[PDB]
Amino acid sequence: KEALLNLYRIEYRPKDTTFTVFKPTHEIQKEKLNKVRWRVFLQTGLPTFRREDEFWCAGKVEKDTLYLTLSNGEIVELKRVGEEEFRGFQNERECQELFRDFLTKTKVKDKFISDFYKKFRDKITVQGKNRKIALIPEVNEKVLKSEEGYFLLHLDLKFRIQPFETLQTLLERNDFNPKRIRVKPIGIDFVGRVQDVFKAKEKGEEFFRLCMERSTHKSSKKAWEELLKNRELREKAFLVVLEKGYTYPATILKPVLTYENLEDEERNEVADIVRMEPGKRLNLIRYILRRYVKALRDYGWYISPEEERAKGKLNFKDTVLDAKGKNTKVITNLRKFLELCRPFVKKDVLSVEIISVSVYKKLEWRKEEFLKELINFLKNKGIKLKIKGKSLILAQTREEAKEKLIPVINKIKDVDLVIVFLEEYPKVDPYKSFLLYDFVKRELLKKMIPSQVILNRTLKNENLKFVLLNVAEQVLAKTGNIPYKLKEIEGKVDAFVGIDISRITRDGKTVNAVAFTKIFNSKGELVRYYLTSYPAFGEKLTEKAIGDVFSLLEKLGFKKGSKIVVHRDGRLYRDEVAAFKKYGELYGYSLELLEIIKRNNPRFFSNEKFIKGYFYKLSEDSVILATYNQVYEGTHQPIKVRKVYGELPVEVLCSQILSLTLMNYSSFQPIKLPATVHYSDKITKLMLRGIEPIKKEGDIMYWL
């Protein structure tokens, strides 16, 4: 019951307290700020943080002006205000900046990735039939503020998986139609998706003069130099444009592959290393830290040698019942519960469409038996599946399958369910990497038809009853037969609203946009969903879409003075909060706004397997919360919940979030996110391509 986090108390108290400060001559546009700051560090050479409009240099600087060209060739000028004495930090952001700069200046992170290779280089490269593979250690630092006000170094170690195959080589010597695949420049931090390719032979003399002069990195600068000088290399060179329109050569660019999109054999070898015993990882994290402490004390940095501790566990209403009234009183077996449990049936007859994908012809038995023993079970709970029809697709690659699956899925109209038995296709072109289950999952969600996709591996590895249960629990939910409801969720909330929005973009403007909102009652039954798309609204999108959710609430007529909680899977911005405040009033509901950041949070290292509810409390009403228990295979990552505004204590809102977890209806498989916003991001994103307008609502969790 002791849980440590990779978070270390840290402060800066040097003997020399004398910075040189610089002020812009023309108020800097916001998204230009981090590029200026960084540019100041290079030039000056000294560590640097942004305080407001002004720039603080950990050294004396006798140049009264600083001219800094950005990539556009745009010159920002800064006048020199004068020396000021650093009494202390105003926020993590300044602290983070200066600290990183100090790592850079001292080269520790560097000396570290070096030593680590010298040591484990061999164990880090891995084979498998045709391709070869590297897993390169990544050290990351962020700075956070605890509840008590201490600054906290967030220190992690990861491994990014990458081949030995520079883009140039792939587009030149190999391919056809690449793109979409995300990338990382040698010698540059940033990693991101591709969004434009053209040959270099297009561009004149100027263009590489200009990239050379500007590129803020040695690798980028050396590379544009090559293509300046070496006369015919521009014909041969192809040029990529990333997510943040950064534009680089090809020889500089390498792909970053996920676990998933590797081979069967690759992944299991790689896996030992990418995912690793918590204690081991934490031993490394401590190792790296000691390097840091030794490189930085002398400059006045003070870093606690010791990890921070879970403040405790939170209890939530985890009690759950069926159409009879059977309880957590049985829940001392989750399995034993679902067998006996008797679901809330609102659709007596189900019509099902069966898709089987396999390599050969007379081997449906494992799938016939399952399907059988499951019609069975569902009938014993008042539900008949009428099979509207089967389709057996024979196919030899994932590619062949995908292809045939298309006209098949295409034609499926009017069903309550699609079941897909997929066989396993072991390999495939390392670029053409679809996931078959994904593909099938995508196509059907597009159609708004609930689906259950069953991997043939599962039938082969796993015990019939285990698999029977897992599936039955979801299949029921999916179809609107909620095999159990919650007794209660803490608080006196009257609605729980999940909010998700994605937007396509051109030049730098919101073009298409898809919104996805799901409203749950106080018990956390789902009341309705709304799947809506918007066309272009400049500054008005936010107001519009937010209001749309409010009116919809009135349309379900939640009475004035009703408490309404909002969850979003992502940073809500200021313009949005002010938006929720407006309609907060105009409709007259007490509102709790929660922002959930799910990626890259500090981990909990701990012996207890049953972590669910463990938490830690940062500044400004935010909470590292763990939602699922530790799997051995998995890499546990908790969620960060943040009370952006409202009358309730976050720990109560976190308790709520823990409850809604169970509404995902997935006992056997951990699910990070509460049912309000679970998969919401995939759905919005999925629909964005959906050439053409969309307005759907429903009352059935079709997306499980």
Added chain:
RNA sequence: AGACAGCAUAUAUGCUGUCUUU
């Protein structure tokens, strides 16, 4: 047939530096 040096190639070797891994 021999010792010097200066040149030619090949092979093999020792150190430094850079990048692979800022």
Added chain:
RNA sequence: AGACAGCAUAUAUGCUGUCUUU
């Protein structure tokens, strides 16, 4: 550990000069 750059070096064989050997 490997690849590129910059230095150092061993051994084999000839090469041109050069002593000697007048």
